[PDB]
PDB file of all heavy atoms in Angstrom:
ATOM      1  N   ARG A   1     194.631  93.391 186.871  1.00 16.04           N
ATOM      2  CA  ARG A   1     193.290  93.979 186.614  1.00 16.04           C
ATOM      3  C   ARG A   1     192.327  92.867 186.182  1.00 16.04           C
ATOM      4  O   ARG A   1     191.154  92.913 186.592  1.00 16.04           O
ATOM      5  CB  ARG A   1     193.392  95.064 185.536  1.00 16.04           C
ATOM      6  CG  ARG A   1     192.063  95.625 185.050  1.00 16.04           C
ATOM      7  CD  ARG A   1     191.599  96.849 185.818  1.00 16.04           C
ATOM      8  NE  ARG A   1     190.287  97.316 185.377  1.00 16.04           N
ATOM      9  CZ  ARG A   1     190.033  97.956 184.233  1.00 16.04           C
ATOM     10  NH1 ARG A   1     190.998  98.224 183.369  1.00 16.04           N
ATOM     11  NH2 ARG A   1     188.792  98.324 183.957  1.00 16.04           N
ATOM     12  N   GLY A   2     192.809  91.913 185.381  1.00 13.68           N
ATOM     13  CA  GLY A   2     191.961  90.900 184.719  1.00 13.68           C
ATOM     14  C   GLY A   2     192.314  89.466 185.076  1.00 13.68           C
ATOM     15  O   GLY A   2     193.511  89.144 185.277  1.00 13.68           O
ATOM     16  N   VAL A   3     191.277  88.637 185.163  1.00 11.15           N
ATOM     17  CA  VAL A   3     191.380  87.158 185.155  1.00 11.15           C
ATOM     18  C   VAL A   3     190.652  86.620 183.922  1.00 11.15           C
ATOM     19  O   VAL A   3     189.484  86.890 183.776  1.00 11.15           O
ATOM     20  CB  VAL A   3     190.839  86.586 186.467  1.00 11.15           C
ATOM     21  CG1 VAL A   3     190.957  85.076 186.499  1.00 11.15           C
ATOM     22  CG2 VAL A   3     191.538  87.221 187.663  1.00 11.15           C
ATOM     23  N   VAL A   4     191.364  85.916 183.048  1.00 11.86           N
ATOM     24  CA  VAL A   4     190.820  85.223 181.844  1.00 11.86           C
ATOM     25  C   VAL A   4     190.704  83.722 182.137  1.00 11.86           C
ATOM     26  O   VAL A   4     191.713  83.081 182.431  1.00 11.86           O
ATOM     27  CB  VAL A   4     191.722  85.498 180.629  1.00 11.86           C
ATOM     28  CG1 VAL A   4     191.267  84.731 179.384  1.00 11.86           C
ATOM     29  CG2 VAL A   4     191.815  87.001 180.358  1.00 11.86           C
ATOM     30  N   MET A   5     189.502  83.177 182.005  1.00  9.04           N
ATOM     31  CA  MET A   5     189.157  81.753 182.264  1.00  9.04           C
ATOM     32  C   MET A   5     188.632  81.113 180.972  1.00  9.04           C
ATOM     33  O   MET A   5     187.652  81.622 180.399  1.00  9.04           O
ATOM     34  CB  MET A   5     188.090  81.702 183.356  1.00  9.04           C
ATOM     35  CG  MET A   5     187.687  80.312 183.725  1.00  9.04           C
ATOM     36  SD  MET A   5     186.566  80.253 185.146  1.00  9.04           S
ATOM     37  CE  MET A   5     186.316  78.486 185.211  1.00  9.04           C
ATOM     38  N   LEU A   6     189.259  80.033 180.519  1.00  6.55           N
ATOM     39  CA  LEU A   6     188.968  79.431 179.190  1.00  6.55           C
ATOM     40  C   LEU A   6     188.372  78.029 179.328  1.00  6.55           C
ATOM     41  O   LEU A   6     188.258  77.328 178.310  1.00  6.55           O
ATOM     42  CB  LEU A   6     190.267  79.391 178.389  1.00  6.55           C
ATOM     43  CG  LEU A   6     190.895  80.750 178.127  1.00  6.55           C
ATOM     44  CD1 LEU A   6     192.357  80.617 177.818  1.00  6.55           C
ATOM     45  CD2 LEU A   6     190.187  81.429 176.985  1.00  6.55           C
ATOM     46  N   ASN A   7     187.918  77.676 180.519  1.00  7.13           N
ATOM     47  CA  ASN A   7     187.280  76.368 180.803  1.00  7.13           C
ATOM     48  C   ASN A   7     185.983  76.637 181.570  1.00  7.13           C
ATOM     49  O   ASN A   7     185.887  77.718 182.210  1.00  7.13           O
ATOM     50  CB  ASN A   7     188.238  75.404 181.534  1.00  7.13           C
ATOM     51  CG  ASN A   7     188.641  75.912 182.898  1.00  7.13           C
ATOM     52  OD1 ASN A   7     189.429  76.860 183.026  1.00  7.13           O
ATOM     53  ND2 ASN A   7     188.080  75.320 183.935  1.00  7.13           N
ATOM     54  N   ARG A   8     185.044  75.681 181.494  1.00  5.90           N
ATOM     55  CA  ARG A   8     183.897  75.508 182.424  1.00  5.90           C
ATOM     56  C   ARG A   8     184.395  74.791 183.683  1.00  5.90           C
ATOM     57  O   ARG A   8     185.440  74.081 183.611  1.00  5.90           O
ATOM     58  CB  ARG A   8     182.770  74.753 181.715  1.00  5.90           C
ATOM     59  CG  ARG A   8     182.060  75.573 180.642  1.00  5.90           C
ATOM     60  CD  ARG A   8     181.144  74.776 179.732  1.00  5.90           C
ATOM     61  NE  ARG A   8     181.765  73.638 179.066  1.00  5.90           N
ATOM     62  CZ  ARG A   8     182.606  73.740 178.028  1.00  5.90           C
ATOM     63  NH1 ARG A   8     182.945  74.927 177.559  1.00  5.90           N
ATOM     64  NH2 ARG A   8     183.136  72.662 177.475  1.00  5.90           N
ATOM     65  N   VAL A   9     183.698  74.989 184.809  1.00  2.20           N
ATOM     66  CA  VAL A   9     184.012  74.341 186.126  1.00  2.20           C
ATOM     67  C   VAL A   9     183.930  72.805 186.025  1.00  2.20           C
ATOM     68  O   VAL A   9     184.759  72.100 186.683  1.00  2.20           O
ATOM     69  CB  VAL A   9     183.124  74.936 187.234  1.00  2.20           C
ATOM     70  CG1 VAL A   9     183.044  74.086 188.485  1.00  2.20           C
ATOM     71  CG2 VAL A   9     183.608  76.320 187.587  1.00  2.20           C
ATOM     72  N   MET A  10     182.984  72.301 185.226  1.00  5.60           N
ATOM     73  CA  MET A  10     182.818  70.851 184.942  1.00  5.60           C
ATOM     74  C   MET A  10     182.885  70.612 183.428  1.00  5.60           C
ATOM     75  O   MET A  10     182.123  71.272 182.688  1.00  5.60           O
ATOM     76  CB  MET A  10     181.483  70.327 185.479  1.00  5.60           C
ATOM     77  CG  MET A  10     181.300  68.830 185.266  1.00  5.60           C
ATOM     78  SD  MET A  10     180.391  68.005 186.595  1.00  5.60           S
ATOM     79  CE  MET A  10     181.431  68.425 187.993  1.00  5.60           C
ATOM     80  N   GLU A  11     183.762  69.693 183.002  1.00  5.51           N
ATOM     81  CA  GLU A  11     183.879  69.259 181.592  1.00  5.51           C
ATOM     82  C   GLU A  11     184.108  67.740 181.579  1.00  5.51           C
ATOM     83  O   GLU A  11     184.943  67.236 182.361  1.00  5.51           O
ATOM     84  CB  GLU A  11     185.034  69.997 180.898  1.00  5.51           C
ATOM     85  CG  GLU A  11     184.930  71.521 180.921  1.00  5.51           C
ATOM     86  CD  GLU A  11     185.916  72.202 179.989  1.00  5.51           C
ATOM     87  OE1 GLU A  11     186.626  71.473 179.313  1.00  5.51           O
ATOM     88  OE2 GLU A  11     185.970  73.434 179.946  1.00  5.51           O
ATOM     89  N   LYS A  12     183.404  67.029 180.698  1.00  6.70           N
ATOM     90  CA  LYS A  12     183.512  65.563 180.561  1.00  6.70           C
ATOM     91  C   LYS A  12     183.150  64.895 181.895  1.00  6.70           C
ATOM     92  O   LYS A  12     183.802  63.902 182.226  1.00  6.70           O
ATOM     93  CB  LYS A  12     184.939  65.230 180.125  1.00  6.70           C
ATOM     94  CG  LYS A  12     185.334  65.652 178.713  1.00  6.70           C
ATOM     95  CD  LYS A  12     186.825  65.554 178.575  1.00  6.70           C
ATOM     96  CE  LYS A  12     187.308  65.349 177.159  1.00  6.70           C
ATOM     97  NZ  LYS A  12     188.690  65.857 176.987  1.00  6.70           N
ATOM     98  N   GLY A  13     182.183  65.450 182.641  1.00  6.76           N
ATOM     99  CA  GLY A  13     181.669  64.903 183.907  1.00  6.76           C
ATOM    100  C   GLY A  13     182.652  64.996 185.070  1.00  6.76           C
ATOM    101  O   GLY A  13     182.408  64.346 186.122  1.00  6.76           O
ATOM    102  N   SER A  14     183.730  65.765 184.959  1.00  5.02           N
ATOM    103  CA  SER A  14     184.715  65.915 186.070  1.00  5.02           C
ATOM    104  C   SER A  14     184.933  67.386 186.417  1.00  5.02           C
ATOM    105  O   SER A  14     184.597  68.241 185.589  1.00  5.02           O
ATOM    106  CB  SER A  14     186.028  65.271 185.744  1.00  5.02           C
ATOM    107  OG  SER A  14     185.838  63.940 185.302  1.00  5.02           O
ATOM    108  N   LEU A  15     185.552  67.669 187.561  1.00  4.20           N
ATOM    109  CA  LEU A  15     185.819  69.081 187.958  1.00  4.20           C
ATOM    110  C   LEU A  15     187.156  69.529 187.377  1.00  4.20           C
ATOM    111  O   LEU A  15     188.163  68.848 187.598  1.00  4.20           O
ATOM    112  CB  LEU A  15     185.764  69.199 189.478  1.00  4.20           C
ATOM    113  CG  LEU A  15     184.346  69.071 190.015  1.00  4.20           C
ATOM    114  CD1 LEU A  15     184.350  68.821 191.506  1.00  4.20           C
ATOM    115  CD2 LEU A  15     183.542  70.309 189.661  1.00  4.20           C
ATOM    116  N   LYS A  16     187.162  70.616 186.621  1.00  8.11           N
ATOM    117  CA  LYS A  16     188.384  71.081 185.915  1.00  8.11           C
ATOM    118  C   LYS A  16     189.002  72.255 186.684  1.00  8.11           C
ATOM    119  O   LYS A  16     190.096  72.730 186.300  1.00  8.11           O
ATOM    120  CB  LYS A  16     188.028  71.412 184.463  1.00  8.11           C
ATOM    121  CG  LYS A  16     187.696  70.196 183.595  1.00  8.11           C
ATOM    122  CD  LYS A  16     188.824  69.171 183.452  1.00  8.11           C
ATOM    123  CE  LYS A  16     188.392  67.884 182.767  1.00  8.11           C
ATOM    124  NZ  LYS A  16     189.238  66.720 183.136  1.00  8.11           N
ATOM    125  N   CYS A  17     188.375  72.620 187.801  1.00  4.23           N
ATOM    126  CA  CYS A  17     188.532  73.928 188.466  1.00  4.23           C
ATOM    127  C   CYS A  17     187.562  74.055 189.654  1.00  4.23           C
ATOM    128  O   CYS A  17     186.398  73.623 189.513  1.00  4.23           O
ATOM    129  CB  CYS A  17     188.214  74.963 187.407  1.00  4.23           C
ATOM    130  SG  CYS A  17     188.479  76.652 187.952  1.00  4.23           S
ATOM    131  N   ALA A  18     188.007  74.649 190.768  1.00  4.78           N
ATOM    132  CA  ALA A  18     187.139  75.071 191.898  1.00  4.78           C
ATOM    133  C   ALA A  18     186.283  76.277 191.474  1.00  4.78           C
ATOM    134  O   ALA A  18     186.722  77.048 190.645  1.00  4.78           O
ATOM    135  CB  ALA A  18     187.975  75.396 193.113  1.00  4.78           C
ATOM    136  N   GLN A  19     185.075  76.394 192.020  1.00  5.27           N
ATOM    137  CA  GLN A  19     184.219  77.601 191.940  1.00  5.27           C
ATOM    138  C   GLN A  19     184.864  78.675 192.836  1.00  5.27           C
ATOM    139  O   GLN A  19     184.609  78.653 194.056  1.00  5.27           O
ATOM    140  CB  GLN A  19     182.813  77.200 192.405  1.00  5.27           C
ATOM    141  CG  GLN A  19     181.784  78.333 192.441  1.00  5.27           C
ATOM    142  CD  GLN A  19     181.424  78.847 191.070  1.00  5.27           C
ATOM    143  OE1 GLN A  19     181.294  78.085 190.105  1.00  5.27           O
ATOM    144  NE2 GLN A  19     181.256  80.160 190.974  1.00  5.27           N
ATOM    145  N   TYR A  20     185.695  79.556 192.282  1.00  4.29           N
ATOM    146  CA  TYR A  20     186.560  80.481 193.060  1.00  4.29           C
ATOM    147  C   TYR A  20     185.975  81.913 193.083  1.00  4.29           C
ATOM    148  O   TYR A  20     186.572  82.793 193.707  1.00  4.29           O
ATOM    149  CB  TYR A  20     187.992  80.408 192.513  1.00  4.29           C
ATOM    150  CG  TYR A  20     188.191  80.867 191.085  1.00  4.29           C
ATOM    151  CD1 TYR A  20     188.394  82.199 190.780  1.00  4.29           C
ATOM    152  CD2 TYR A  20     188.185  79.974 190.031  1.00  4.29           C
ATOM    153  CE1 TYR A  20     188.602  82.618 189.472  1.00  4.29           C
ATOM    154  CE2 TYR A  20     188.379  80.377 188.717  1.00  4.29           C
ATOM    155  CZ  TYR A  20     188.587  81.706 188.432  1.00  4.29           C
ATOM    156  OH  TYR A  20     188.774  82.118 187.149  1.00  4.29           O
ATOM    157  N   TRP A  21     184.833  82.168 192.442  1.00  2.28           N
ATOM    158  CA  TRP A  21     184.151  83.496 192.523  1.00  2.28           C
ATOM    159  C   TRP A  21     182.707  83.345 193.016  1.00  2.28           C
ATOM    160  O   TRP A  21     182.119  82.271 192.919  1.00  2.28           O
ATOM    161  CB  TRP A  21     184.238  84.209 191.180  1.00  2.28           C
ATOM    162  CG  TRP A  21     183.402  83.599 190.103  1.00  2.28           C
ATOM    163  CD1 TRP A  21     182.188  84.041 189.670  1.00  2.28           C
ATOM    164  CD2 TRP A  21     183.714  82.443 189.302  1.00  2.28           C
ATOM    165  NE1 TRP A  21     181.734  83.246 188.653  1.00  2.28           N
ATOM    166  CE2 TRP A  21     182.647  82.263 188.408  1.00  2.28           C
ATOM    167  CE3 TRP A  21     184.788  81.557 189.240  1.00  2.28           C
ATOM    168  CZ2 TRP A  21     182.615  81.225 187.491  1.00  2.28           C
ATOM    169  CZ3 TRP A  21     184.753  80.527 188.335  1.00  2.28           C
ATOM    170  CH2 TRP A  21     183.679  80.361 187.481  1.00  2.28           C
ATOM    171  N   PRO A  22     182.093  84.409 193.580  1.00  3.55           N
ATOM    172  CA  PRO A  22     180.713  84.360 194.068  1.00  3.55           C
ATOM    173  C   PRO A  22     179.691  84.282 192.919  1.00  3.55           C
ATOM    174  O   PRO A  22     179.955  84.834 191.845  1.00  3.55           O
ATOM    175  CB  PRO A  22     180.539  85.687 194.816  1.00  3.55           C
ATOM    176  CG  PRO A  22     181.946  86.198 195.001  1.00  3.55           C
ATOM    177  CD  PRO A  22     182.671  85.744 193.756  1.00  3.55           C
ATOM    178  N   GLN A  23     178.552  83.617 193.168  1.00  2.00           N
ATOM    179  CA  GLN A  23     177.490  83.363 192.152  1.00  2.00           C
ATOM    180  C   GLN A  23     176.377  84.412 192.302  1.00  2.00           C
ATOM    181  O   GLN A  23     175.567  84.567 191.412  1.00  2.00           O
ATOM    182  CB  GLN A  23     176.992  81.925 192.299  1.00  2.00           C
ATOM    183  CG  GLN A  23     178.123  80.894 192.248  1.00  2.00           C
ATOM    184  CD  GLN A  23     177.727  79.562 191.644  1.00  2.00           C
ATOM    185  OE1 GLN A  23     177.574  78.559 192.341  1.00  2.00           O
ATOM    186  NE2 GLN A  23     177.558  79.549 190.330  1.00  2.00           N
ATOM    187  N   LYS A  24     176.352  85.126 193.413  1.00  2.00           N
ATOM    188  CA  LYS A  24     175.235  86.003 193.770  1.00  2.00           C
ATOM    189  C   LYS A  24     175.847  87.210 194.476  1.00  2.00           C
ATOM    190  O   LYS A  24     176.746  86.995 195.301  1.00  2.00           O
ATOM    191  CB  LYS A  24     174.234  85.215 194.624  1.00  2.00           C
ATOM    192  CG  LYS A  24     173.418  84.212 193.834  1.00  2.00           C
ATOM    193  CD  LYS A  24     172.517  83.314 194.660  1.00  2.00           C
ATOM    194  CE  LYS A  24     172.262  81.977 193.975  1.00  2.00           C
ATOM    195  NZ  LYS A  24     170.877  81.486 194.185  1.00  2.00           N
ATOM    196  N   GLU A  25     175.369  88.407 194.128  1.00  2.00           N
ATOM    197  CA  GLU A  25     175.760  89.708 194.728  1.00  2.00           C
ATOM    198  C   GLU A  25     175.822  89.600 196.254  1.00  2.00           C
ATOM    199  O   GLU A  25     176.769  90.083 196.845  1.00  2.00           O
ATOM    200  CB  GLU A  25     174.749  90.776 194.276  1.00  2.00           C
ATOM    201  CG  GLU A  25     174.944  91.250 192.833  1.00  2.00           C
ATOM    202  CD  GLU A  25     174.196  90.501 191.739  1.00  2.00           C
ATOM    203  OE1 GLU A  25     173.783  89.344 191.994  1.00  2.00           O
ATOM    204  OE2 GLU A  25     174.006  91.099 190.629  1.00  2.00           O
ATOM    205  N   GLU A  26     174.827  88.978 196.880  1.00  2.54           N
ATOM    206  CA  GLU A  26     174.585  89.116 198.343  1.00  2.54           C
ATOM    207  C   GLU A  26     175.344  88.023 199.105  1.00  2.54           C
ATOM    208  O   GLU A  26     175.344  88.108 200.359  1.00  2.54           O
ATOM    209  CB  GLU A  26     173.082  89.135 198.671  1.00  2.54           C
ATOM    210  CG  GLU A  26     172.342  87.841 198.361  1.00  2.54           C
ATOM    211  CD  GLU A  26     171.823  87.729 196.947  1.00  2.54           C
ATOM    212  OE1 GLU A  26     172.275  88.514 196.117  1.00  2.54           O
ATOM    213  OE2 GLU A  26     170.971  86.871 196.686  1.00  2.54           O
ATOM    214  N   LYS A  27     175.927  87.042 198.398  1.00  5.82           N
ATOM    215  CA  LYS A  27     176.709  85.925 199.006  1.00  5.82           C
ATOM    216  C   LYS A  27     178.169  86.089 198.594  1.00  5.82           C
ATOM    217  O   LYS A  27     178.592  85.444 197.620  1.00  5.82           O
ATOM    218  CB  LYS A  27     176.183  84.558 198.563  1.00  5.82           C
ATOM    219  CG  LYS A  27     174.778  84.204 199.026  1.00  5.82           C
ATOM    220  CD  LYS A  27     174.705  83.662 200.444  1.00  5.82           C
ATOM    221  CE  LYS A  27     173.283  83.414 200.908  1.00  5.82           C
ATOM    222  NZ  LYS A  27     172.681  82.252 200.203  1.00  5.82           N
ATOM    223  N   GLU A  28     178.890  86.932 199.318  1.00  4.70           N
ATOM    224  CA  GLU A  28     180.342  87.156 199.134  1.00  4.70           C
ATOM    225  C   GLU A  28     181.140  85.974 199.713  1.00  4.70           C
ATOM    226  O   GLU A  28     180.581  85.202 200.505  1.00  4.70           O
ATOM    227  CB  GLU A  28     180.747  88.482 199.779  1.00  4.70           C
ATOM    228  CG  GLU A  28     180.704  88.478 201.294  1.00  4.70           C
ATOM    229  CD  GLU A  28     179.364  88.746 201.959  1.00  4.70           C
ATOM    230  OE1 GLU A  28     178.315  88.649 201.285  1.00  4.70           O
ATOM    231  OE2 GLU A  28     179.387  89.055 203.161  1.00  4.70           O
ATOM    232  N   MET A  29     182.408  85.836 199.316  1.00  6.47           N
ATOM    233  CA  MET A  29     183.328  84.786 199.817  1.00  6.47           C
ATOM    234  C   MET A  29     184.441  85.461 200.618  1.00  6.47           C
ATOM    235  O   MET A  29     184.974  86.484 200.180  1.00  6.47           O
ATOM    236  CB  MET A  29     183.948  83.971 198.677  1.00  6.47           C
ATOM    237  CG  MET A  29     182.946  83.465 197.669  1.00  6.47           C
ATOM    238  SD  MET A  29     183.666  82.613 196.238  1.00  6.47           S
ATOM    239  CE  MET A  29     184.484  81.266 197.081  1.00  6.47           C
ATOM    240  N   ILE A  30     184.800  84.847 201.731  1.00 10.40           N
ATOM    241  CA  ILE A  30     185.972  85.212 202.570  1.00 10.40           C
ATOM    242  C   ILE A  30     186.998  84.080 202.466  1.00 10.40           C
ATOM    243  O   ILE A  30     186.619  82.908 202.606  1.00 10.40           O
ATOM    244  CB  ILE A  30     185.555  85.444 204.035  1.00 10.40           C
ATOM    245  CG1 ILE A  30     184.393  86.430 204.144  1.00 10.40           C
ATOM    246  CG2 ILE A  30     186.746  85.894 204.855  1.00 10.40           C
ATOM    247  CD1 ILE A  30     184.755  87.807 203.701  1.00 10.40           C
ATOM    248  N   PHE A  31     188.243  84.439 202.191  1.00  9.16           N
ATOM    249  CA  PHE A  31     189.414  83.537 202.257  1.00  9.16           C
ATOM    250  C   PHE A  31     190.099  83.872 203.575  1.00  9.16           C
ATOM    251  O   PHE A  31     190.708  84.939 203.691  1.00  9.16           O
ATOM    252  CB  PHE A  31     190.223  83.688 200.965  1.00  9.16           C
ATOM    253  CG  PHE A  31     189.359  83.555 199.734  1.00  9.16           C
ATOM    254  CD1 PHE A  31     188.925  84.671 199.046  1.00  9.16           C
ATOM    255  CD2 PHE A  31     188.899  82.315 199.322  1.00  9.16           C
ATOM    256  CE1 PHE A  31     188.102  84.546 197.939  1.00  9.16           C
ATOM    257  CE2 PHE A  31     188.082  82.184 198.208  1.00  9.16           C
ATOM    258  CZ  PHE A  31     187.680  83.301 197.523  1.00  9.16           C
ATOM    259  N   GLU A  32     189.864  83.031 204.571  1.00  6.97           N
ATOM    260  CA  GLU A  32     190.355  83.238 205.953  1.00  6.97           C
ATOM    261  C   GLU A  32     191.876  83.191 205.934  1.00  6.97           C
ATOM    262  O   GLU A  32     192.518  84.036 206.571  1.00  6.97           O
ATOM    263  CB  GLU A  32     189.829  82.146 206.888  1.00  6.97           C
ATOM    264  CG  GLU A  32     188.317  82.011 206.885  1.00  6.97           C
ATOM    265  CD  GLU A  32     187.730  81.841 208.272  1.00  6.97           C
ATOM    266  OE1 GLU A  32     187.912  80.759 208.863  1.00  6.97           O
ATOM    267  OE2 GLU A  32     187.117  82.805 208.766  1.00  6.97           O
ATOM    268  N   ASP A  33     192.414  82.233 205.198  1.00  4.25           N
ATOM    269  CA  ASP A  33     193.871  81.951 205.150  1.00  4.25           C
ATOM    270  C   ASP A  33     194.639  83.138 204.545  1.00  4.25           C
ATOM    271  O   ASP A  33     195.786  83.317 204.928  1.00  4.25           O
ATOM    272  CB  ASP A  33     194.155  80.628 204.423  1.00  4.25           C
ATOM    273  CG  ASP A  33     193.721  80.554 202.962  1.00  4.25           C
ATOM    274  OD1 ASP A  33     192.753  81.300 202.575  1.00  4.25           O
ATOM    275  OD2 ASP A  33     194.356  79.755 202.215  1.00  4.25           O
ATOM    276  N   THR A  34     194.068  83.908 203.619  1.00  4.14           N
ATOM    277  CA  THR A  34     194.814  84.997 202.922  1.00  4.14           C
ATOM    278  C   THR A  34     194.229  86.369 203.257  1.00  4.14           C
ATOM    279  O   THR A  34     194.866  87.363 202.826  1.00  4.14           O
ATOM    280  CB  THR A  34     194.905  84.755 201.407  1.00  4.14           C
ATOM    281  OG1 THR A  34     193.627  84.469 200.854  1.00  4.14           O
ATOM    282  CG2 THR A  34     195.808  83.594 201.066  1.00  4.14           C
ATOM    283  N   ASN A  35     193.113  86.414 204.000  1.00  5.53           N
ATOM    284  CA  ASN A  35     192.535  87.650 204.581  1.00  5.53           C
ATOM    285  C   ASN A  35     191.975  88.558 203.481  1.00  5.53           C
ATOM    286  O   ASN A  35     192.221  89.779 203.512  1.00  5.53           O
ATOM    287  CB  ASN A  35     193.574  88.384 205.422  1.00  5.53           C
ATOM    288  CG  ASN A  35     192.990  88.742 206.758  1.00  5.53           C
ATOM    289  OD1 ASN A  35     192.875  89.918 207.092  1.00  5.53           O
ATOM    290  ND2 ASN A  35     192.578  87.715 207.487  1.00  5.53           N
ATOM    291  N   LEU A  36     191.236  87.968 202.550  1.00  6.67           N
ATOM    292  CA  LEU A  36     190.681  88.663 201.365  1.00  6.67           C
ATOM    293  C   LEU A  36     189.177  88.430 201.331  1.00  6.67           C
ATOM    294  O   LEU A  36     188.767  87.345 201.702  1.00  6.67           O
ATOM    295  CB  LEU A  36     191.356  88.096 200.114  1.00  6.67           C
ATOM    296  CG  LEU A  36     192.806  88.512 199.922  1.00  6.67           C
ATOM    297  CD1 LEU A  36     193.463  87.634 198.897  1.00  6.67           C
ATOM    298  CD2 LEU A  36     192.906  89.956 199.488  1.00  6.67           C
ATOM    299  N   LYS A  37     188.405  89.432 200.923  1.00  6.00           N
ATOM    300  CA  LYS A  37     186.946  89.297 200.711  1.00  6.00           C
ATOM    301  C   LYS A  37     186.651  89.601 199.248  1.00  6.00           C
ATOM    302  O   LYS A  37     187.261  90.536 198.723  1.00  6.00           O
ATOM    303  CB  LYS A  37     186.196  90.245 201.631  1.00  6.00           C
ATOM    304  CG  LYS A  37     184.701  90.283 201.377  1.00  6.00           C
ATOM    305  CD  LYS A  37     183.946  91.117 202.381  1.00  6.00           C
ATOM    306  CE  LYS A  37     183.612  92.497 201.868  1.00  6.00           C
ATOM    307  NZ  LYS A  37     182.673  93.191 202.783  1.00  6.00           N
ATOM    308  N   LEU A  38     185.783  88.800 198.625  1.00  3.94           N
ATOM    309  CA  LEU A  38     185.497  88.855 197.165  1.00  3.94           C
ATOM    310  C   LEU A  38     183.979  88.934 196.921  1.00  3.94           C
ATOM    311  O   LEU A  38     183.234  87.992 197.303  1.00  3.94           O
ATOM    312  CB  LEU A  38     186.110  87.627 196.493  1.00  3.94           C
ATOM    313  CG  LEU A  38     185.885  87.556 194.992  1.00  3.94           C
ATOM    314  CD1 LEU A  38     186.759  88.538 194.266  1.00  3.94           C
ATOM    315  CD2 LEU A  38     186.151  86.171 194.476  1.00  3.94           C
ATOM    316  N   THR A  39     183.526  90.004 196.273  1.00  2.50           N
ATOM    317  CA  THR A  39     182.084  90.288 196.088  1.00  2.50           C
ATOM    318  C   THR A  39     181.737  90.371 194.603  1.00  2.50           C
ATOM    319  O   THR A  39     182.485  91.034 193.885  1.00  2.50           O
ATOM    320  CB  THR A  39     181.743  91.577 196.821  1.00  2.50           C
ATOM    321  OG1 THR A  39     182.303  91.428 198.126  1.00  2.50           O
ATOM    322  CG2 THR A  39     180.254  91.819 196.870  1.00  2.50           C
TER     323      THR A  39
END
């Protein structure tokens, strides 16, 4: 049901994590490899 995230995407000027969720209602993400859509 839940995803808990305890980091920012960028910390100490480096990437700690991919941006894995959508930033805007109207710009959904498709994962072609796993056949999932995320809104």
Side-chain angles (χ1 to χ4, degrees):
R1 173 92 183 286
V3 181
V4 176
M5 181 173 179
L6 299 159
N7 63 287
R8 289 168 305 285
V9 162
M10 183 145 302
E11 303 192 2
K12 291 166 155 154
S14 309
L15 289 165
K16 290 300 171 205
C17 185
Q19 178 68 39
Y20 64 85
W21 70 101
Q23 306 212 253
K24 286 174 207 217
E25 284 90 340
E26 65 273 15
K27 295 278 176 71
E28 70 276 17
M29 311 175 61
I30 308 294
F31 309 100
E32 305 223 288
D33 62 334
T34 50
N35 229 242
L36 288 165
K37 174 174 100 170
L38 180 74
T39 311

